[model samples]
Each structure stands twice: as structure tokens, then as C-alpha cells.
Target chain A: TYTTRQIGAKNTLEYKVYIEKDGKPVSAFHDIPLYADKENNIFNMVVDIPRWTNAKLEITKEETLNPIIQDTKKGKLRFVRNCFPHHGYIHNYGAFPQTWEDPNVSHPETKAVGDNDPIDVLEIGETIAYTGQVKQVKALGIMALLDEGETDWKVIAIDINDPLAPKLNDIEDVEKYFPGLLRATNEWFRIYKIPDGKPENQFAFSGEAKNKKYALDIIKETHDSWKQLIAGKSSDSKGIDLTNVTLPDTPTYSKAASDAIPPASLKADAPIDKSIDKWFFISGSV
Target chain B: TYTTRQIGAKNTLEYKVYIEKDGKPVSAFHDIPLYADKENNIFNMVVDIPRWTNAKLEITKEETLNPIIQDTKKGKLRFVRNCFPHHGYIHNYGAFPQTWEDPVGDNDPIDVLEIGETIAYTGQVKQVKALGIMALLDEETDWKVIAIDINDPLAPKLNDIEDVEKYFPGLLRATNEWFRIYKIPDGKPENQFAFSGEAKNKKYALDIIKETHDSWKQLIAGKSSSKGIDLTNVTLPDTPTYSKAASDAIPPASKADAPIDKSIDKWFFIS
Candidate 1:
């Protein structure tokens, strides 16, 4: 018998995407080249979007490029099944650490994950598979927060579609299928809004300046830190000086001194006017 | 120079917890031993309720316990704050994956980070230095898979609360908290009978059961599977033929369909 060895097989692929508006060429959008190392095969294609003149991205083939696995069932949006299993639009940003808890800490978890870290770009011989996906969806709504003397606060609805999730199992037949089931809320999917109804002409861009900021008030019940707010006041009356006059050792609620102040009550203080709405959203959808 | 290790820093500690009822020991509820490790001081205890005796668990402290730090807030359930940040209570089981898109499957992200399957025992041991958490809430609820054939088919609330005791949440606060977050029709939480005052007592439980079953049906529709409905039938079918027919497929939607041709329906056929 001839000698046989289980050697590995290898292959490579390259993709280049280009965009144009009003028949004029602009700098091409950033591309993440991918390689599919099976048997060698090269596929080159062009993605052109002219309607999104002010927008940076245009979905070249949202529907036509879906899997026609069975009888035609048009996918609703852009996912394996067409309609997002969840309402939220998805972006094929990249794979992240499995142990990451605060998804928002990364690129796709809504907020950014992974601090601004650099990846080592290697020679072409090293191959990696990559997928790219991004879409423009309706911006459901936005909430702005402004606190007393606080200036540096800005954010847009990163995932508004979440609160608008579809109501699951509203029919009587539901019990017929899933017995012993208690709550099947959002069982089939999750949804998120990109922004509060952003027009097609204005797509979400990947940059800092595209975000909107609001002056949020500081409320004692929600926040313990007022140093930032105290510093952001008018330049002359702001920073440490004004805070020295207003701040206290033990913060207290101010309801005009009730007739007379008890010895202990004298130590308490009230929060500034703008600090009423100082609470920031954390876990639940805003 | 003298070197000294921390006090009460033993490699392991032994603790016994008992379930008492009416000031007497419930033999059906057995005693469990706890083992603590040096690295992790907290002990995770999983008490499985026996099928018989309709077990009701009542935990009593064998020894006096103290928290490393107290929140100083009254009205909150008392617990070792340093060890247990939040009071132990019933929580949603299998509700969410640590990272929904981990791609690695359901293994806890913390477990993956730790790299090994480590088991610890004891509140004191668990609270030492590592992040502490209450025991994972029980997985199975007191609710049972009730197959209500013709007899109780009209009575949607099939299982009595007595029959499903200890499995459902007893605390009003816990139940209401989770109820508000649950999803209902039209993005309105009121549609859910469990949280909404629309149904009460047996009526509410029955409504929730019906709603969840319907939700399962929608999910099964998306999935190309037939097992969704076929499994559950009324516990005792009033008619023999109906009973036999239901055994093969989901029992007829109603009694009227019992005598009709029971061949497969288009909706049931995925292909």
C-alpha cells in the first residue's frame, strides 16, 4: 500500500467593497479582508450605494442574497432568517470574549466592549474567516439627561428596539403547545431600535461626534458623586469654590427648615436644583 | 520578624443545616453536610425536594451568623452582606445566558473564566475574598405538566396550588418584581394575567399557563418540529377514542373533532 498522510488543506480569498454618491467617487469605506481556506477559490465583487449620500453604509444585497432553503419565505430584515429573530438590527462587528458580562463594554453589545485595544496584523499566509453586516433601522426614541452644573454628558439611543419587543404567545392555543410553561415572554426573539426614527438619509456612523449630548441633573437618591457637576457650573462660580459653599460632609434633603432645626438636622443639606434628575440608566432599556 | 496567617483561616469548616416544620424535624427532608475550601469560602447548597410528602423547605441556622458588612438599611432581608450582596430569593431559571452571543453555549461566563468546575460549601468560606452570589434559584417550579383531557379541558386552571406547592414564588415582592418585567401583548405588561389584576388565584395561574403554552406554540412554529403539542393531553380523556387519538397527536382542539378523520393537518406538516 502507498504511504498516506493526513495533511491539511489551505486556501485564500480577498474582497474589495466600494461606494459612490451622485456619480462621484469618494474614499472607500474600511474593509476587513477575509479568507476561506478550503480549496483555493477567489471571488471578487463590488457593493455600490449612491442613495446614502450623507450615510456611510448602504446594504448592497439585503434580500437577494438570502438562503432559499425551502418554499419561499421572504426574510423580514437582515439575518439568517431574514426577519431578525429579535427586532433589533444586527451588525457583524466581530467575535468577542465569551466571559464578557457587560456586553455593552464591547463593540456590538450596544456600548463598546474591549478598551481601545490593537490587534496584531499578521502576514497574508495566516488566514482568518470574517463576516461583515450592518443595517439602518428606525430610531425609536431618545432620552437626554442634564444635571446641575454638569456639562459633559451625551448619548443617543443605542438600542431602542429592545423596549419595543413583540408580545409573545398572545393566543389561546399557546398552552396547547408548550405545557407547564409559565412565561414565554420574548421567547422567540429580542428587538432593539437603532435610534429614535433617524431618517434614511442620516444613517448611524461609527464615530464620537455623531452622538448627541444632554445636560443631565444630579439627584441625590440616584447619585453619590456631585464633584463633576459642581465643577461644570459657570466658569466664575464653578469648580471647587462654589462646591465648597454648597457641598457638605453629610448630604441631606432640603425641605425648608421645618419650624426649627434639630441639632442633628442642622448637619443635613439639600441637593442642588439641577441634581433632581441625576440618575443614569444601567441594566434595563432606557 | 514573625509571620502569621489570618485567624479562623482553616482549610475547611463543617456546617449542618436542617429543615424544621412545626418545631419538629422532617425526616423526609434530610440533613446535608457542607464543605468549604480555602480559596473559596462560600458554600453553594442545592437542596432537592423529594417527590413525596409535598416537601416544604424551612431553613434554620444551626449556628449564629454575622455579615462582614451591613448595608445599614432596614426592611431588607437580613443576610451576610459581604457574602451575599442581595438577599437570596427565587430567581428566573435559564432566563438568560451571561452573554447572549457568546457562541460557546450555556456554560456560565464566570465558570469559563475560572477554567475549572469548582464546588464550594459554607457561607463563611464563600464570603472570604471571591465574588459572592446567592444560590442559583431552583430550576423546576411546583407547577406540573397537567394533561387536561375532556374532563378539565374547559377548566384551564388544572393544577391546584396545593399540588404545586414550594415550586412557585411565595414572596409577593419577588413575584411582582418579575411580573413587571415579563412581556405581554402590545408591549403592555397588563396583558399578562400573573401581574395584571385581570385574573386572581386559580384564575391567574390558569391564564398564565394558557399564555405560556400559546407562546410556546409560536416558537414551535418557527422551528420545524412536531413534538411541541403532541406531548401534552388532558390527564384523563372522557372518551376512549379521543384518548387514543390524542396519544398519537395533540388531542383534538375540541370534542367535536373527535369523530372526524384524524389525518395530519397542513399546519402540522413542516415539509
Candidate 2:
């Protein structure tokens, strides 16, 4: 069992974990950013536990206010002040291990890019996790957010065995149990960026919540996206296709697309869609 | 076993606790406001855990964004839009249980003065040395509790925010930012009037605290609110136990600095 201790008097806890180098153990904070093995995954999802209902956790380097954004190439983390003063993420926020949203993938609708970071997750329930606990979770929903023209997918999950998890089996269940969780989650995302002068229109969510089946499908698709990048997929390659992905039955999220159908405004016309020959001709006798 | 399961794949936990009433049990959230003994003991120290580094927790109602000030007589809670959008608080914050800031119409007790420890339990207390004054106003006003941790050997030698910055670097900056962001969403002016009255430094903070404590005795002893408090003989110390000018020579931000361009100085001036 992972040893957890309450840090200070707040309802926050930190846990101990170790990193292995050449199979030799070395202690480190749970989020030291070690990659997971395809055959035997090891990295635990890093949850910002203090990020409960009204308490916000601004993730920075251990003692700074700078935002910690992921740098995938060097397998390292870096800080930036561009987004300082942003509010705490609204949900129990975390990211999956051994997962990646390849930069090459562009959401078919938004024509936006990807952040090239691990897919994000949000757990919704009454239970709070300690900082370093490795949890086996089940996805319940997914939110497709376009951040500064990049596709950032947040997969919603719950601990497979949480007493509350059984009550929340899908997106609709989230609303039924927590009542306003999805709305608040969407509202938080909508306004969190405004503090840093980000325009509301610059961001869009596919919808506040999608069904569990859709979430699992997207998780598999993102895992495939990660695998494709590992195999050296070109930056311009058509990433994961959302053309067949279904939209919610009653779209309540303000910025959500009505359906999987890409707007006519976004579809490529005749010549551009004619493939390599048209591309070669346009490039002048290639 | 406590049946600890990581909820939502996020690092948020929910624990089961049984509330007993007449020997019967009821399930509830940890913070559901049920009076323990009911002579006036409802408010929890509401510390914003991540705020340990910075000294701020934006005070909001237990279930909403409304501020949870006190109703002294009936031992109830009241809400006011007067302070809406202001961050809950800045500092490891909590209030004294029985004490009440009687003069301030809100009737909430003087802030139970935190003594440098970030995470003191919500319902715990320490026999403290009153430090000085933390004056505040938003149409209505009162002095808040400021004290030193006599029991903590490692506690910072502090008298005011200046001392707070001395021991905990960057804390003051963070506090400033907190007040800055606290009200932006509510569309209120950024700076609300706040200061340390007669609390030029820690020594003054302590002196004012003692004076307030004595006054508190009378207020609780049945002194009419109309009679008012007298601090005429409470002299200001010659040298501030903590000095904003000596530390940086920059005038501390004041309430007037709150609204004018670059005038946060209006709202945060250290007197």
C-alpha cells in the first residue's frame, strides 16, 4: 500500500513513490515524469488533489507561480508565465500515462492543432485521491476542447471501484449525481482563460460531456494517435478522424458543434481534394 | 480499512463520516454546517490548502460564492453582495469561535488570528499572543485578529505583512495578486479598502491586539455597542517592529491605490 500523509491541515495528501534507473530504485515525487512501458505501464496519473470544489491548485514548479506546460520531445517539463493567474482547473484534473495527442492530429471540425501532450482526464465523485496514488479508472465521458487552435481532449473518468462511481455511468449520470458539475466544468473552462486576456471565442468544447462509450472510443483513438507518432507519422498526416464520431443528443454546451458533420465552410473543394496529382500540379511540374 | 478509493481519476477524495443526532446517524459531507454544541461555533477555518505558499483563501459561503459573515445574536449566518467577487481570504484564515467583532454590524468575531502555520485544523485553537490590527472596510468595517504563535518555536518573528514577507519571501507579492484577482470576475473594483490600523509593525499589532482584547471583555460583559471602543491611551510604538519603508522604502500599497490607474497604492497603503 502506498503510504499517504496529510500535508499540513488542509484536506490534501502527498504520497511516496520511486523511479527506477537500469532497474535500480531512486525515490522521487510521483510526477517526476517517467514514461510508461507499453508492455508494463508504470506512471501514475498526476492529480492536483487540492483542486476540489472551490479550492484551486495552480500547478507550477514546486514553489513558483509559473505554469508547467509539457515538453514532449526532451521528455521534460518547462515553465511559462504566459498563463499565470489562471484559475485552478475546475475538476479533479489529471492526465493518463503512456498517452499522447500527437501534434500532427488536427480536429476535423476546428482545423486546430494538438498540444502534443498526454490526454487529460477529469474524475467526478465525492472521493479525493492522494497526490501519488496509482488508480485504475474507468472513462465515463470526454470533452473536446480547442486550446489556442489546438485539439486538447479531456477524458472524464472515475475510479473503477469508488462507491460513487457505480452511480455515475455516463455523461447524463454526472448531471444526475452532482447536478451542475458539467455546467460548472464547462463554465470554468470558458472563463479560466479570460483572466489572462484570452478571448472566449478562441476556445470551444465539443460539448460539456459525452457518453462513456464515446469516451472509451476516444481513449483508444488517442492511444492509437500516440502509437502512430511513435512510429514517425508525418506532421501533415490526417490524424484521428472524428467524422464518424457522434454528437450528443441534446447539445447544451454553447460552443459544441451540432453534429459530426464538418461545416461546409471547412470542407476542401474539388481541386484540393483531388489528391497528390492536384498537389503536384499546384507546386509547378513536380 | 477506510475504504480509500481514488475518485474521478483526479486527486480528489471523499471520506464517509457519520453525524450522530440523538444517538442516530446521518450521512453528510464533511463541511455540512451542523452546529456542534450551538452557542456559536459553526464556521470552520476554511483554509485554501494550495494557498499555503501565498497567504490567501478567498472566503465564500459553504455552498456558494456569497461571503459567510456572522449574525452574532441568533447565532446564524448572513450573506451580503457588498463583498461579492472579493477573494475569500488571503492567508491561512479562520475565525475565533465565541468572540465577536460586535462593533462591525456583521457581528462576526474578530478573525481568530492565524500565527504563521498554514494548515492549523479547522476547529483547533492556540493560546496566542495578540499581535496587532488588520483593519478592513467595504461600506462597513472592523479590525481583524492578528496574533503571534507563542507556542511555535519555528514560527516566524512577525508583526505584520512586512514581517510576513521577511520570513516568507514572495508571499507578499502573492497576497497582492490575490487582492488583485479576487474581485475581477464579479466586475467590482480590484482593490477594496484594507489596512493595518495602529499596527505599524508587530509590536503595534500586539499592542492593538491587547487593547482590542480588553475592549472585547467589555463588549462581551454587556457594554452597549453605542458606547464605542476607546484606544486613546494605547500609544504607538516608536520604532515599528516591522517597517515597510525600511524593507523596501517603497510606500506600501494603500486603499486609495485600488481604483486609479496604477493606484493600487490607494487600496493597500501600509500605515
Candidate 3:
């Protein structure tokens, strides 16, 4: 018997599913877009996905957003400003350097492709060098676009205090801090099957400890667990009960519980459930 | 070159994606049923659906709240005469003759089937008699689900009113007259394709009125034409300006110079 699966693409509810048997994975179906009403909601396919007693299904979102028409234009505009840095150099010397070459006068290459993948400018004393090195300002602008978003940060391993830590630049560490943005921007949804669900062979993240990277890992792990539950290999889990644990000392959550043990746990009176000390990080002022 | 199709009988995210050819209907793709996230948050499916050239896609919510569930220990409860009837029927004795048997208790086979699906009931005689009808009421008192709350009822025609209409003959006609609840609910998620590219032939409610009895026929015919838009066939309907013949009296929507007739023409358009 054959089956048809549809993933509506235009509805902001896009998803992809695949099939797997043993360790061999396969794209079970082809993309045939469908719509619900007069909207541009497109649907895709995951046909004849093989079912196995020991096999499992997996689902995840695509990791990145594609360069849309709007994105391309914005990326281009930022590249130009990054290339020409004051005659192409910052003029700390005066208002406008008398010996500096005029920008209006046609030079060898005013536009170049920067490291941030935008068109930028490059000038080496005007002897004629055609290099696509965007100005620092333009690179910063493109970097700002990539940095301007929220992330689903997961707490991998908390280091309450690291003595050797350098001065942390909040502006420079936007990508590292807001790692969850990577998963949020993804459009592709995928689902695969697996033989014998086991925790021993878990997938690892492409990046390390970014808030989004951790968030993506958590979502992926949660989705994998759900698939395993569907295969009857494991039972479903309800939400965790954090009633006993003391609320964090942040202004957002200021409740302090006497005990730190969970209400319904295997070891309620374990030594690990010690009272956590108060933390101070920028005092959340900024 | 060759294609196959099957329906995915999934409880979670249930939907059907058909494959078509040459502007006609076609088949399915594979056999594995699609499943949504158990929490109902995320869902995924892959099928061999036929792509349309200009078919519009739209999505809307089909929201429903869970029904309140009440429990009782009494295997069966009866509506006694001590209280003025809040629910479960009221018998004045003047409506019918001396011997009015509860519909559920009636030995007639038809009455038994109707009582089996009564679901909720009112009317004093029927309430007391309904006890003998349901066997489960006698077995497990703990399992008894006595539901009496119905705040704002928006009943579907087939399930609630249409089937229940027989008990009170005139009630169904009264309720169904204003609002039509028979329209089937779309099972697919929001933004799924409701129809193919463009509807070929579409009908308006005015057609039904035209074919109705002669009492109102004369009134309808007096107008130049009917007050309904042709969904399938529509011209360029650009925005039009208007002049007030009489400033005191507002112009009629039908009598406007350039009517904004767009929504019905396109399967999906934001007002």
C-alpha cells in the first residue's frame, strides 16, 4: 500500500520527514507542494516511510535561513561602507587630508567582497590593488544583522566563576551568547528513522556552547526522545516539576526555597541538593 | 515514470494530500502515516501532492475547548417533582394524554436507539425513564460522568441538533433556520490547500431563493438583478470613487459605482 504525506510550506508550518532502516537512511518521498486555502501554504512529501519494530523516527528544523531578496540587498548595502574607511583610512590627522585621493574620482576598485560575504571596497594607496576587503565599518554592519536576534540558550555546564576569564565584551560575543538564533532561523524540517533507539549513540552539535547551539541540541534531543516513545522503545515524559528547587536569584525569578531537592525524584534527600549561592552578573542593569 | 498513492491514517496531524494531473485529480505517494508531535506543538509529513499553477493557500484556526466532565456516585439519578426543572425535561401533563411513557423506556426499537445516543437530556418524564435505558449507569457508580453544563452551545448540525431533532420535532427547524451548522470542519492544519487552483463553477445563495416558492419571488424579481457576486467569474474590479446624490442618505453597498468584489473571486484574500 502507498501513502501520501503533505507538509504545508507557506503556512509558517513547514516540516520534512525521511525514512531509515538499520543504519541506512533514505529520502522516502519527493516534494509535492499542497495548499490549504487561497494562501501560498505549500506542502511537501514523505511517502512510504518504512516502519520497523526496532526502528524510530526523527524530526528537526533546518539550521539556517536562506538569503532572500531582502537579505541580499541588506548584505550588499553593508558591504560598501565597510570597504572605504576614510580615503580609505580613518582621518585622525585632520578634517580631510589634503593629499588624500578624491572618492568621486574613479579609482581602481571601490567595491569588494568582504569576509562577511557582502560587496566591499579595497584601496592600497591607489597604486591599483583590486582586493575585495570590506571596510571594518561595513563588516561590523553585516555582523550586526547576524547578531540582531534572540537565541534559545541551553545551560550545558555552568561555571559560576572562572578566575582566568578575560574582560568579556558583550558586543563582540553576541554570536557566542545568543546561540539559539541558529535553530530559530532554520526553515527545513527533517525526520528520519533509526533501528534500536539507544542513548549511547547520540548526535553532537556543530558548534560548541552557543546559546542557540545548546538550544538546538535540546530541541533535537527532545524530538528524538519523542520518536523513541512513538516506537514504543521508551515512554513519554511529562514536564519536570521544579516546585522544590529554589527559584534563581535573578530579578525575573526571586523566590527562594528552603530546600533544593525535587518533589518527585529518585533521591529526594541526596547531598547534591544543596542550597545554591547568590550570583552577581552585571546586576542585570544593562 | 510510475506513481502510487495511499492515505495516511494518522491520529495526530491527520490530513490528505492528493496528486493530480492535467487539471484533474490523481493519487497518493507512499504508505507510512504521518505523525505530529505528541504535545501538538510541531508536526511533519511528506507526500506526493500535485503542484498547482496558481492555487491559493490559506489557513485558519478550528478552535475548540474541552467539555467539562462531572462525576457522580449514584448509578442512576432521577428528576423528582420536588424541584422546578433546571434540566432533564419538564412534563406539564397537558401537552399529552394520560399515559406518557418516557421515550427511553418505551419497548419500541426506534426509541431504544434514540436513547442510546441521547448524550444529554431534559424533560422530567424522560429523565427518570432514561435510567432503565443505559446499562452502564447500573454497573459502575465511580465511572458515571454526569455533565450538566452547556454555557454557549455552537452545535454542529449532524452530531448534535440534526440527530437530536426527532425528540422535539419543531426545535431543529427553529435552530437551523438562522445559522447553518452543517458545514463540515476542515481537518487539515491551517494554510493547507482547501481547493485546487480556481473553482470552475460556483453557486450563490440567491440561486436558491430564485427557485423558492412564489410568496417572495415577486419582491426579488422587482430588482434589476440579484444581490450576489459570481465567485468563479469576476472582472478587473478596480477601486472606484463615489458622489453623494443626497448627503443626508448613505449610499447602498449594492448600488456603489465600483464594488469591491475580490474575496470570493480569489480562494484566499485578506480583507
TM-score of each: 0.18, 0.40, 0.12
Q: Of the true interface contacts, what fraction does each candidate have?
A: 0.00, 0.00, 0.00
Give the per-residue lDDT digits (tens) of candidate 3, residues B155-242.
Answer: 2222232233333333222222101111111122222111221111112211211222132222123322222211110111221211
Better of 1 and 2 by DockQ: 2
Instruction: Give residue B236's error in model 3 in angstroms.
Output: 69
Quality of candidate 1's docking, in CAPRI categories?
incorrect
Residue A267 error, candidate 2, Å: 54
Overall lDDT per candidate, in order of appearance:
0.19, 0.39, 0.17
Chain B vs. true chain B: TM-score for each candidate?
Answer: 0.19, 0.43, 0.13
- The CAPRI classification for model 2 reads as incorrect
Model 2 iRMSD vs. native:
26.3
Best by DockQ: 2
lDDT (tens digit, per residue) of candidate 2 on A1-286:
3232222322222211222223222122212232333232223454543232222322222211112222222432211111112223434676664356667656564577676666777765434454434455666777777766677777777766566766766778766655655665665555554433565433454465767777666666666765454344546433322211121221211112223212222211112111110100001111
Candidates ranked by lDDT, best first?
A: 2, 1, 3
**Top-TM-score structure, candidate number:** 2
Please give the range of 10 consecutive residues that has the lowest summed lDDT in model 3 chain A.
A90-99
Score candidate 3 by TM-score against the native.
Answer: 0.12
Evaluation by lDDT, superior candidate among 1 and 3: 1
